[PDB]
Write an enzyme that holds these catalytic residues in place. Sequence first.
Site, PDB file in Angstrom:
ATOM      1  N   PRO B  38       0.748  -1.284   0.059  1.00  0.00           N
ATOM      2  CA  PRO B  38      -0.109  -0.043   0.022  1.00  0.00           C
ATOM      3  C   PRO B  38       1.095   1.426   0.114  1.00  0.00           C
ATOM      4  O   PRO B  38       2.161   1.453   0.547  1.00  0.00           O
ATOM      5  CB  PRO B  38      -0.614  -0.056   1.315  1.00  0.00           C
ATOM      6  CG  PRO B  38      -0.687  -1.418   1.705  1.00  0.00           C
ATOM      7  CD  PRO B  38       0.614  -1.939   1.357  1.00  0.00           C
ATOM      8  N   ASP B  39       0.120   2.244  -0.738  1.00  0.00           N
ATOM      9  CA  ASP B  39       0.889   3.885  -0.493  1.00  0.00           C
ATOM     10  C   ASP B  39       0.212   4.375   0.538  1.00  0.00           C
ATOM     11  O   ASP B  39      -0.407   3.789   1.388  1.00  0.00           O
ATOM     12  CB  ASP B  39       0.766   4.354  -1.863  1.00  0.00           C
ATOM     13  CG  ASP B  39      -0.715   4.819  -2.295  1.00  0.00           C
ATOM     14  OD1 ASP B  39      -1.738   4.487  -1.593  1.00  0.00           O
ATOM     15  OD2 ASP B  39      -0.948   5.346  -3.383  1.00  0.00           O
ATOM     16  N   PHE B  40       0.602   5.669   0.948  1.00  0.00           N
ATOM     17  CA  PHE B  40      -0.232   6.475   1.853  1.00  0.00           C
ATOM     18  C   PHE B  40      -1.537   7.173   0.961  1.00  0.00           C
ATOM     19  O   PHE B  40      -2.464   7.399   1.543  1.00  0.00           O
ATOM     20  CB  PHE B  40       0.620   7.650   2.347  1.00  0.00           C
ATOM     21  CG  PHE B  40       1.628   7.219   3.347  1.00  0.00           C
ATOM     22  CD1 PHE B  40       1.118   6.964   4.470  1.00  0.00           C
ATOM     23  CD2 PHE B  40       2.791   7.424   3.349  1.00  0.00           C
ATOM     24  CE1 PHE B  40       1.871   6.779   5.881  1.00  0.00           C
ATOM     25  CE2 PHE B  40       3.725   7.225   4.258  1.00  0.00           C
ATOM     26  CZ  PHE B  40       3.163   6.756   5.546  1.00  0.00           C
ATOM     27  N   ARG B  41      -1.223   7.400  -0.239  1.00  0.00           N
ATOM     28  CA  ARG B  41      -2.315   8.301  -1.053  1.00  0.00           C
ATOM     29  C   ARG B  41      -3.692   7.610  -1.163  1.00  0.00           C
ATOM     30  O   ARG B  41      -4.527   8.247  -1.169  1.00  0.00           O
ATOM     31  CB  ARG B  41      -1.670   8.555  -2.439  1.00  0.00           C
ATOM     32  CG  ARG B  41      -2.609   9.246  -3.358  1.00  0.00           C
ATOM     33  CD  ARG B  41      -3.094  10.857  -2.964  1.00  0.00           C
ATOM     34  NE  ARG B  41      -3.892  11.440  -3.704  1.00  0.00           N
ATOM     35  CZ  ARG B  41      -5.258  11.310  -3.847  1.00  0.00           C
ATOM     36  NH1 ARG B  41      -5.952  10.161  -2.872  1.00  0.00           N
ATOM     37  NH2 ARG B  41      -6.119  11.903  -4.773  1.00  0.00           N
ATOM     38  N   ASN B 112      11.179   4.124  -1.480  1.00  0.00           N
ATOM     39  CA  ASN B 112      10.731   2.705  -1.130  1.00  0.00           C
ATOM     40  C   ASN B 112      11.491   1.808  -0.232  1.00  0.00           C
ATOM     41  O   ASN B 112      12.790   1.705  -0.377  1.00  0.00           O
ATOM     42  CB  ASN B 112      10.045   1.897  -2.374  1.00  0.00           C
ATOM     43  CG  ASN B 112       9.107   2.614  -3.016  1.00  0.00           C
ATOM     44  OD1 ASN B 112       8.452   3.324  -2.672  1.00  0.00           O
ATOM     45  ND2 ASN B 112       8.689   1.882  -4.392  1.00  0.00           N
ATOM     46  N   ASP B 114      10.878  -1.589   0.259  1.00  0.00           N
ATOM     47  CA  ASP B 114      10.376  -2.869  -0.014  1.00  0.00           C
ATOM     48  C   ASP B 114      11.152  -3.943  -0.745  1.00  0.00           C
ATOM     49  O   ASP B 114      10.918  -5.009  -0.857  1.00  0.00           O
ATOM     50  CB  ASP B 114       8.968  -3.072  -0.740  1.00  0.00           C
ATOM     51  CG  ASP B 114       9.041  -2.191  -2.234  1.00  0.00           C
ATOM     52  OD1 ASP B 114       9.873  -2.220  -2.866  1.00  0.00           O
ATOM     53  OD2 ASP B 114       8.099  -1.426  -2.286  1.00  0.00           O
ATOM     54  N   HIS B 131      15.078   6.515   1.880  1.00  0.00           N
ATOM     55  CA  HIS B 131      14.395   6.245   3.120  1.00  0.00           C
ATOM     56  C   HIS B 131      14.947   4.916   3.626  1.00  0.00           C
ATOM     57  O   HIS B 131      14.232   4.262   4.519  1.00  0.00           O
ATOM     58  CB  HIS B 131      12.992   6.549   3.167  1.00  0.00           C
ATOM     59  CG  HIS B 131      12.561   7.920   2.542  1.00  0.00           C
ATOM     60  ND1 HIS B 131      11.193   8.046   2.400  1.00  0.00           N
ATOM     61  CD2 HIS B 131      13.240   9.035   2.650  1.00  0.00           C
ATOM     62  CE1 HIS B 131      11.127   9.290   2.231  1.00  0.00           C
ATOM     63  NE2 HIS B 131      12.457   9.968   2.256  1.00  0.00           N
TER      64      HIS B 131
HETATM   65  N1  LIG Z   1       6.482   0.620  -0.930  1.00  0.00           N
HETATM   66  C1  LIG Z   1       7.119   1.493   0.127  1.00  0.00           C
HETATM   67  O1  LIG Z   1       8.130   1.400   0.484  1.00  0.00           O
HETATM   68  C2  LIG Z   1       6.293   2.424   0.816  1.00  0.00           C
HETATM   69  C3  LIG Z   1       4.817   2.396   0.847  1.00  0.00           C
HETATM   70  C4  LIG Z   1       4.095   3.228   1.481  1.00  0.00           C
HETATM   71  C5  LIG Z   1       4.579   4.437   2.043  1.00  0.00           C
HETATM   72  N2  LIG Z   1       5.916   4.628   1.614  1.00  0.00           N
HETATM   73  C6  LIG Z   1       6.575   6.035   2.104  1.00  0.00           C
HETATM   74  O2  LIG Z   1       5.652   6.909   1.699  1.00  0.00           O
HETATM   75  C7  LIG Z   1       6.371   8.296   1.807  1.00  0.00           C
HETATM   76  C8  LIG Z   1       5.663   9.013   0.501  1.00  0.00           C
HETATM   77  O3  LIG Z   1       6.000   8.663  -0.564  1.00  0.00           O
HETATM   78  P1  LIG Z   1       5.232   8.850  -2.004  1.00  0.00           P
HETATM   79  O4  LIG Z   1       5.187  10.027  -2.486  1.00  0.00           O
HETATM   80  O5  LIG Z   1       5.886   7.797  -2.791  1.00  0.00           O
HETATM   81  O6  LIG Z   1       3.909   8.106  -1.422  1.00  0.00           O
HETATM   82  P2  LIG Z   1       2.331   8.698  -1.647  1.00  0.00           P
HETATM   83  O7  LIG Z   1       1.300   7.538  -1.101  1.00  0.00           O
HETATM   84  O8  LIG Z   1       2.401   9.956  -0.810  1.00  0.00           O
HETATM   85  O9  LIG Z   1       2.221   9.050  -3.197  1.00  0.00           O
HETATM   86  C9  LIG Z   1       1.934   7.703  -3.959  1.00  0.00           C
HETATM   87  C10 LIG Z   1       1.699   8.581  -5.529  1.00  0.00           C
HETATM   88  O10 LIG Z   1       1.626   7.228  -6.320  1.00  0.00           O
HETATM   89  C11 LIG Z   1       0.395   7.634  -7.006  1.00  0.00           C
HETATM   90  N3  LIG Z   1       0.100   6.041  -7.281  1.00  0.00           N
HETATM   91  C12 LIG Z   1      -0.134   4.940  -6.477  1.00  0.00           C
HETATM   92  N4  LIG Z   1      -0.250   3.743  -7.228  1.00  0.00           N
HETATM   93  C13 LIG Z   1      -0.022   4.093  -8.523  1.00  0.00           C
HETATM   94  C14 LIG Z   1       0.066   3.433  -9.783  1.00  0.00           C
HETATM   95  N5  LIG Z   1       0.113   1.992  -9.562  1.00  0.00           N
HETATM   96  N6  LIG Z   1       0.735   3.996 -10.997  1.00  0.00           N
HETATM   97  C15 LIG Z   1       0.641   5.330 -10.683  1.00  0.00           C
HETATM   98  N7  LIG Z   1       0.570   6.087  -9.765  1.00  0.00           N
HETATM   99  C16 LIG Z   1       0.281   5.420  -8.640  1.00  0.00           C
HETATM  100  C17 LIG Z   1      -0.544   8.058  -6.188  1.00  0.00           C
HETATM  101  O11 LIG Z   1      -1.736   8.858  -7.029  1.00  0.00           O
HETATM  102  C18 LIG Z   1       0.376   9.044  -5.585  1.00  0.00           C
HETATM  103  O12 LIG Z   1       0.697  10.401  -6.315  1.00  0.00           O
HETATM  104  C19 LIG Z   1       7.784   7.927   1.758  1.00  0.00           C
HETATM  105  O13 LIG Z   1       8.472   8.442   2.526  1.00  0.00           O
HETATM  106  C20 LIG Z   1       7.942   6.276   1.545  1.00  0.00           C
HETATM  107  O14 LIG Z   1       8.892   5.857   2.090  1.00  0.00           O
HETATM  108  C21 LIG Z   1       6.753   3.660   1.073  1.00  0.00           C
HETATM  109  C1  LIG Z   2       8.970   6.591   5.644  1.00  0.00           C
HETATM  110  O1  LIG Z   2       8.076   7.115   4.788  1.00  0.00           O
HETATM  111  C2  LIG Z   2       8.890   5.315   5.965  1.00  0.00           C
HETATM  112  C3  LIG Z   2      10.475   4.819   5.740  1.00  0.00           C
HETATM  113  C4  LIG Z   2       8.954   5.179   7.388  1.00  0.00           C
HETATM  114  C5  LIG Z   2       8.225   4.422   5.175  1.00  0.00           C
HETATM  115  S1  LIG Z   2       6.358   4.856   5.658  1.00  0.00           S
HETATM  116  C6  LIG Z   2       5.790   3.122   5.996  1.00  0.00           C
HETATM  117  C7  LIG Z   2       5.792   2.083   4.642  1.00  0.00           C
HETATM  118  C8  LIG Z   2       5.343   0.720   5.080  1.00  0.00           C
HETATM  119  C9  LIG Z   2       4.865  -0.154   3.813  1.00  0.00           C
HETATM  120  C10 LIG Z   2       4.872  -1.575   3.872  1.00  0.00           C
HETATM  121  C11 LIG Z   2       6.143  -2.012   4.932  1.00  0.00           C
HETATM  122  C12 LIG Z   2       5.678  -3.365   5.424  1.00  0.00           C
HETATM  123  C13 LIG Z   2       6.277  -4.708   4.926  1.00  0.00           C
HETATM  124  C14 LIG Z   2       7.088  -4.662   4.064  1.00  0.00           C
HETATM  125  C15 LIG Z   2       8.432  -5.760   3.918  1.00  0.00           C
HETATM  126  C16 LIG Z   2       9.656  -5.418   3.161  1.00  0.00           C
HETATM  127  C17 LIG Z   2      10.491  -6.524   3.062  1.00  0.00           C
END
Ligand SMILES: NC(=O)c1ccc[n+]([C@@H]2O[C@H](COP(=O)([O-])OP(=O)(O)OC[C@H]3O[C@@H](n4cnc5c(N)ncnc54)[C@H](O)[C@@H]3O)[C@@H](O)[C@H]2O)c1
Ligand SMILES: *C(=O)C(C)(C)CSCCCCCCCCCCCC
Lengths: 7, 294
Positions: B38-41, B112, B114, B131
């Site tokens: 999951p993302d945050f958005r 990311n 992950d 990060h």
């Molecule tokens: N996978 C991860 O490691 C993970 C997951 C969740 C949050 N985060 C953390 O969230 C914080 C904010 O980062 P961010 O700006 O990347 O996240 P965000 O959730 O704020 O923004 C994600 C963006 O991606 C877009 N989006 C989502 N799925 C999409 C898809 N399949 N195709 C195209 N666009 C898509 C959304 O519309 C949004 O603009 C960071 O500090 C990050 O470390 C990381």
């Molecule tokens: C900053 O935005 C941080 C680095 C804190 C990320 S926000 C939290 C993102 C969580 C996504 C899901 C992670 C849990 C399982 C992932 C396992 C990877 C091996």
Amino acid sequence: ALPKKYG
Amino acid sequence: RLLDELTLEGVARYMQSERCRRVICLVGAGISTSAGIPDFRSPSTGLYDNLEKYHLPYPEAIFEISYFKKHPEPFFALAKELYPGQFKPTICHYFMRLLKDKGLLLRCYTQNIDTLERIAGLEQEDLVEAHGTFYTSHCVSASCRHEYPLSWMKEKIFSEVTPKCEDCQSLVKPDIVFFGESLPARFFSCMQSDFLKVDLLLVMGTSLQVQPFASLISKAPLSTPRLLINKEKAGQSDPFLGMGMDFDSKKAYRDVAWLGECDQGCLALAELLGWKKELEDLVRREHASIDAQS
Ligand SMILES: NC(=O)c1ccc[n+]([C@@H]2O[C@H](COP(=O)([O-])OP(=O)(O)OC[C@H]3O[C@@H](n4cnc5c(N)ncnc54)[C@H](O)[C@@H]3O)[C@@H](O)[C@H]2O)c1
Ligand SMILES: *C(=O)C(C)(C)CSCCCCCCCCCCCC
Ligand SMILES: [Zn+2]
């Protein structure tokens, strides 16, 4: 300390 | 200007010109949502959905360092809830693998954690994990700092045992940057050098809100084209804070927005470049090989 992660 | 038109077709023609030798990718959570992370958005599937079971003082606390230091258990419980059953990089990840294989990838800066970039075949030298990552973990005691692989961390996460160091019994923390922590020195060292010589910025799957990562788009030379592949038109200046990306003004000259899924936009770009069969074959081969080891 280096710049920090912030929303 | 370097692009003959502000379209994906214009970006592709530029990529196959002599001028485009060094590509930087800036990616975020949007490139892994189709891999099941999951993302945050997203309001329906994003991280903020289903966080009340954790009894947080506020939702963002589970991602903040001061809360993690007081109560690491909610974060590890969330990690267990979201841990994917398989790690299959997306079409977008494998598009970056093609950029690497064809000698075009200067660097992938990722938000990311992950590990999917590494699974797709990007090397440590190719990556700035801005990060951090779950790939490695460390004991938090300054005098110990014992390193643990993801196989070790996963077992602690799934047995619902807060991971403790085998040498000193301190907490073992995944090598990720929580909100409120300093980014790794590698981020700043690479940023100060890579953007001197970048020919194209490819920004994919990020809302460009988290800092200082989001500021990377301003580090490229003013002539460097910037392509956004993202579901929404991110990176524009805010009309209030402005008292960024310029896709639409009469002065626009180098920024292109392709609004849609990252996998579909990367496939479309690959097709223009003559890479569609290569990308299709690569993704199907890699996913089949991952299945064969499961
Ligand atoms: N996978 C991860 O490691 C993970 C997951 C969740 C949050 N985060 C953390 O969230 C914080 C904010 O980062 P961010 O700006 O990347 O996240 P965000 O959730 O704020 O923004 C994600 C963006 O991606 C877009 N989006 C989502 N799925 C999409 C898809 N399949 N195709 C195209 N666009 C898509 C959304 O519309 C949004 O603009 C960071 O500090 C990050 O470390 C990381
Ligand atoms: C900053 O935005 C941080 C680095 C804190 C990320 S926000 C939290 C993102 C969580 C996504 C899901 C992670 C849990 C399982 C992932 C396992 C990877 C091996
Ligand atoms: Zn230790």
